């Protein structure tokens, strides 16, 4: 029915701890396997942290909240799926004795966790090092981190090219006191949109500056390059004009039928004359173009592209600047698309496309992927997304954090230094985060096969007296420097990991009752 007071606190933490345990083996390159036993006769050995959490049912709503944490993390950044779940679980576990044994009110617990987050975020910055995100060779070395140990490792040179050039193009690199400061906002999902075209190989892929349109044209043989581009965007089709009111036409003599046909031709021409009056070079219409209109416009020295939705016209307008006009007759001479390099209408893979590649960077691009089959096109896309996620995380901040558990251990040590200076009851739940952070270097040792106490103690001592670049060697299990053994990760991931882990723990810790009802 309901679980009240300490029943909610124990139940929420208990479930979250169970979720954390599921994936403790998923951390590090030496991650161990789990056997997922289906209600059917099958069994899955897949060790992907996301799949394991997805494909295993959970009972307690608190466990479902933990699942939402991983889903949010996946949307924010390309990694941390298991970090936020393991860390959030340990934070709850560390807060458990404080709710029960110390009888510390949840309000006190939450306040300290917010303060511990603020301090943890500072430390993650302090221990990080810059990289020159404008040095393409340095960026290629970073991007490969998410490409190796995969079949497509031999593509990594092209995958880095595609990822790096596209994200640089869309990065909103701007600052001023009037139009505001985008602060290097990157949204690859909307701006780097990728299109897959049959034919060629991975090496033939290209990043375009403009819009890649999948719609065909009125004639295959039209100008491909224009010296002074002018672009028209229209909704209304080019067809016989009809009135809005009542019309009654009564024909007795057959001779007058030809007069009606001549009028029908004129009305179509008149629409085209208004289009041609403003000297266009490419006309795009959402609705269709009559056979007469097709010839009327082409003979005027322009190309015509048909069946392009408002959604595409909005993209075309961003890269051309052309204004969308509903009615053909209202087209204005101010509708232009100049400084566009091509209107190529090439048929690629036995499919017609239209390219608006230009010399502009209006906060957007398109990646064009080539491949000899749909499987190749999907394989390139699916793996490229990993490269693009890293390119986003790196280009969004030049600071890289040390891996191998080094960053998390540095937060543990530095929080301990501040904890001794924190007065009041909040000192206790404050320590909870300091200890919880060590779940990462601890788990890495366990998955490597070392001693979780003797190696973790030595690791802590190295950070306590020495530098914050000391981590765990994923392959050997030994304590090694993270500069000699580069395992560096973008700060963006580490900052969001600790941020969302503590916030998620707070969401469960502050709930002292679960009640049923509809």
């Amino acid at each position: 029915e309901r679980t009240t007071g300490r029943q909610a606190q124990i139940s929420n933490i208990t479930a979250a701890k169970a979720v954390a345990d599921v994936i403790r083996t998923c951390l590090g390159p030496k991650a161990m396997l789990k056997m997922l036993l289906d209600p059917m006769g099958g069994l899955v050995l897949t060790n992907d942290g996301h799949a394991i959490l997805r494909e295993i049912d959970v009972a307690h709503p608190a466990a479902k909240s933990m699942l939402e944490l991983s889903r949010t993390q996946d949307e924010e950044v390309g990694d941390g799926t298991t970090t936020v779940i393991i860390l959030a679980g340990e934070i709850l576990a560390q807060c458990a004795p404080y709710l029960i044994e110390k009888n510390i009110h949840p309000v006190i617990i939450i306040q300290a966790l917010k303060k511990a987050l603020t301090d943890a975020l500072e430390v993650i910055k302090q221990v990080s090092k810059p990289v020159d995100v404008e040095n393409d060779a340095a960026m290629k070395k970073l991007i490969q981190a998410s490409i190796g140990t995969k079949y497509v490792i031999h593509w990594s040179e092209k995958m880095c090219e595609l990822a790096l050039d596209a994200v640089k193009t869309v990065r909103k690199d701007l600052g001023q006191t009037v139009e505001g400061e985008p602060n290097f906002e990157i949204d690859i999902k909307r701006y780097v949109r990728v299109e897959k075209i049959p034919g060629g190989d991975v090496l033939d892929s290209r990043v375009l500056k403009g819009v890649l349109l999948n719609k065909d044209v009125v004639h295959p043989k039209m100008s491909r390059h224009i010296e002074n581009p002018r672009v028209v965007l229209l909704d209304c089709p080019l067809e016989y004009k009809k009135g809005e009111s009542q019309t009654n036409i009564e024909i007795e003599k057959e001779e007058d039928w030809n007069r009606i046909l001549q009028i029908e031709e004129e009305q179509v021409q008149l629409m085209c004359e208004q289009i041609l009056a403003v000297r266009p070079t490419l006309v795009i219409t959402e609705k269709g173009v009559s056979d007469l209109a097709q010839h009327y416009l082409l003979k005027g020295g322009c190309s015509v592209l048909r069946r392009v939705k408002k959604s595409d016209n909005n993209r075309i307008a961003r890269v051309t600047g052309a204004t969308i006009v509903n009615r053909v007759e209202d087209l204005k001479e101010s509708d232009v698309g100049t400084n566009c390099g091509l209107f190529k209408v090439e048929m690629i893979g036995d499919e017609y496309f239209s390219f608006l590649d230009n010399c502009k960077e209006p906060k957007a691009c398109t990646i064009m992927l080539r491949g000899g089959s749909k499987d190749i096109l999907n394989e390139i896309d699916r793996n490229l997304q990993d490269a693009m996620a890293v390119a986003r995380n790196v280009m969004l901040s030049p600071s890289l954090s040390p891996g191998g558990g080094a960053t998390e251990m540095a937060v543990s040590v530095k929080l301990a230094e501040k904890a001794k200076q924190l007065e009041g009851i909040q000192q206790w739940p404050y320590q909870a985060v300091a200890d919880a952070m060590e779940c990462i270097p601890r788990t890495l040792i366990q998955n490597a096969g070392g001693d979780p106490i003797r190696l973790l103690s030595q690791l802590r001592a190295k950070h306590a007296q020495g530098n914050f670049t000391t981590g765990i060697d994923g392959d050997k299990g030994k304590i090694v420097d993270m500069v000699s053994y580069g395992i560096w990760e973008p700060e963006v991931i580490k900052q969001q990991s600790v941020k969302t882990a503590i916030e998620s723990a707070c969401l469960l810790l502050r709930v002292d009752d679960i009640v049923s009802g509809v």
Partner: protein
Amino acid sequence: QNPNAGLFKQGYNSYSNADGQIIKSIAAIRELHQMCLTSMGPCGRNKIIVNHLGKIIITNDAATMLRELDIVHPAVKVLVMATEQQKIDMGDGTNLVMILAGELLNVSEKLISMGLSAVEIIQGYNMARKFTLKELDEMVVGEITDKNDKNELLKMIKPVISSKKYGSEDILSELVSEAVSHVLPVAQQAGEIPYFNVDSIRVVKIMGGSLSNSTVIKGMVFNREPEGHVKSLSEDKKHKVAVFTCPLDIANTETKGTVLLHNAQEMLDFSKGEEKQIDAMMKEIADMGVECIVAGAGVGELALHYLNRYGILVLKVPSKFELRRLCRVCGATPLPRLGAPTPEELGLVETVKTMEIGGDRVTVFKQEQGEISRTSTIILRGATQNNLDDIERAIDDGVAAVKGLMKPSGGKLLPGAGATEIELISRITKYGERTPGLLQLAIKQFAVAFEVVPRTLAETAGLDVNEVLPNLYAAHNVTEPGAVKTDHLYKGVDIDGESDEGVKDIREENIYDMLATKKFAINVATEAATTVLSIDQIIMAKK
């Protein structure tokens, strides 16, 4: 059907290390830990004990509870035996060992959950013990100088009585300090000859009244009445006292000695014989100047008739211990025989009288400003059965603690009310932080256990530990004008029951602990905790 592995000794279910025998053993101890946890402090809680003989008492004393409990589980017996160690050669610290030893085990379990072995934990605890014992030597503020002044005694007796009887501390302290000052000699710098046995001070209680009429008697108080005609002695000094173990009647014969009568004349002759022999024995007593006679046995009618005619006060003392104690008041030596109380074996008492205490009449053997007794008696009163019995125990604890003031620096005083315990937390932690390797894990947790005292003192006082403890820690985690802390060595738990906040200075009430009690408890508590941790399996067998 269901198979089991590892169980091959008389079919016993005996858990191995991997089965958590240590954790399960600690869990059993936790039951007793909580029982003792609420005893410590001036505001400790009472317990009802129903003895199997049909006797119900109430006490604050944990050691009484532990002796009245039938303790079966060996894991608890280790700590109960540790409690007995605090009773042997020490008069305090019972709660300190039971509470600290339990907490040391509780924090050990937190380390065991990490994967830290019992061996590694025990080794760290032994180091932290040796560090702790050394640090205590430097926390001394004052020292008892063993001058046996009433005022020096009160400084120690008061905090000792506190936490057994609260609110009557000043009344009971005067009763103990006065009695102690009576039996203690006047001397300084004399440690060659031992003196002041705990038995030197008796406590006597009567139902009815209250402590408002309590007093101290310079001598022994007996619950027996003056059987003879004389109920009191005169106001003169130095009344000669004879003490006998033989009953005051006709002497018997080792072999047979049965008198048979066949003729009326024989009855007359034997009757006169016995009367004359008894008179001769009673006469020889009187002829030595004896004015009071004490028997370890009953008195015959004829002996009463003669002793009355001789004006000798007749007082029966059947207790061998009271007769031995009487030798410390009048000096008389009990006579194994009858009728020859050699003058050298006679004692002297200035006053023997009957007194009314609580409505009950008792006989008192005392001296006033002379021939001063080596024993003292403390007189208690109270109408409530349960409360008066516990007050008696409070008196004994005061005397026992004074015995704790022994030649080997027993007078060293450390700030109490948890002030010592708080400072130890800071110092032991630093010892951990400077210690490399896994040893720091147990040394730090060793320190953690010591917060149980300022916690318990707060809880029993009705205070919110979540506000008192961080205030106590902040009170000691301060900036001082120099490396050595001064003003903030004295910040302890304020056992007031007030509303808002704060800490109290030991100096305000002179709350000090004895170093010997503390260092002893630290040794015993650690040995108890590490002994339990060393046991990863219990096996029963015929011996």
